Design a protein around this nucleic acid. Structure first.
Ligand SMILES: [Ca+2]
Ligand SMILES: [Ca+2]
Ligand SMILES: [Ca+2]
Ligand SMILES: [Ca+2]
Ligand SMILES: [Ca+2]
Length: 307
DNA sequence: TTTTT
């Protein structure tokens, strides 16, 4: 791909009668995030106008949402989707939960950095202002992106202690020591907590998910359930969420666009394998059945192929 | 335009 050739073709398509939405999708959804930035700079040189702003005026509907997200860097997109979710008077806890629970340390520290630059306040402060209680404690801890990294020697002794501790703090006692749960689950490494969750099955008659459902409710319950899935198998999590966004009446397009756009160059192939092996048909197939038009062709290129 | 009541 030639960034200057693409910026030219995208300009010719914006200026074709009715807008040539097809050429725009073919290019942009078939280029890395770096190549999209290149195109966006080249466009700005040929025209002295921002690509993002020209496309907002040229497109509409779901297609516009997809393509303007694509034009953002990974940290910028996630940052913007965290602001969108915390905007207005209410909060979109689900979207918040999904982005925070599923981002790595490296991803979270750049999001924290870029969020400051775009919106002139700190992500933490914006989280504190829109969530309360233990759900705020959990979200604040997760968003620091400071969870311990995997050691070289497995720490079997602490795996057992942590599993015991999760149990003492929950299903065993009356009430719940929620901060014990927040500590263990925000601070320990992902490979470690994978082992904890299995060892926990040794003490408790319920597994980690059952125990969450039986111990807390509401946002806190959702925050912990998403978090355990992301620790256990992150591509499976995104496949399950992709399925939920499409399985019944209509489409939660917001979730479908966000996963396809943010996971396309990260783990889309792993997501597709889990979706196929659990649901029997491809992620590609569910997208084809649920959406129409340029919008559909856009999500399908992000998918990257039928399974 | 995108934040902000
Ligand atoms: Ca428009
Ligand atoms: Ca809000
Ligand atoms: Ca209890
Ligand atoms: Ca419950
Ligand atoms: Ca549907």
């Amino acid at each position: 791909s030639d960034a200057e050739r693409d910026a030219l073709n995208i300009e010719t398509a914006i200026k074709t009668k009715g807008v040539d939405e097809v050429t725009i999708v073919n290019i942009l959804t078939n280029r890395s995030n770096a190549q999209r930035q290149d195109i966006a700079f080249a466009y700005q040189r040929r025209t002295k106008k921002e690509l993002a702003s020209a496309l907002k005026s040229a497109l509409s509907g779901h297609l516009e949402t997809v393509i303007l997200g694509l034009l953002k860097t990974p940290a910028q997109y996630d940052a913007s989707e965290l602001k969108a979710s915390m905007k207005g008077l209410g909060t979109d806890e689900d979207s918040l939960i999904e982005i925070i629970c599923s981002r790595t340390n490296q991803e979270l520290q750049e999001i924290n950095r870029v969020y400051k630059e775009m919106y002139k306040t700190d992500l933490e402060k914006d989280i504190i202002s829109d969530t309360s209680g233990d759900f705020r404690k959990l979200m604040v801890a997760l968003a620091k992106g400071r969870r311990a990294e995997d050691g070289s020697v497995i720490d079997y002794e602490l795996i057992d202690q942590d599993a015991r501790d999760l149990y003492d703090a929950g299903v065993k006692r009356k009430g719940t020591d929620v901060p014990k749960w927040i500590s263990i689950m925000t601070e320990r490494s992902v490979p470690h907590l994978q082992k904890v969750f299995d060892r926990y099955k040794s003490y408790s008659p319920y597994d980690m998910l059952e125990s969450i459902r039986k111990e807390v409710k509401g946002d806190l319950e959702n925050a912990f359930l998403n978090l355990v899935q992301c620790i256990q198998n992150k591509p499976l999590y995104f496949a399950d969420r992709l399925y939920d966004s499409m399985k019944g009446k209509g489409t939660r397009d917001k979730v479908l666009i966000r996963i396809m756009a943010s996971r396309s160059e990260v783990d889309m192939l792993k997501i597709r394998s889990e979706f196929k092996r659990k649901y029997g048909k491809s992620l590609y197939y569910y997208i084809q059945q649920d959406t129409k038009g340029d919008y559909q062709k856009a999500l399908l290129y992000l998918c990257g192929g039928d399974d």
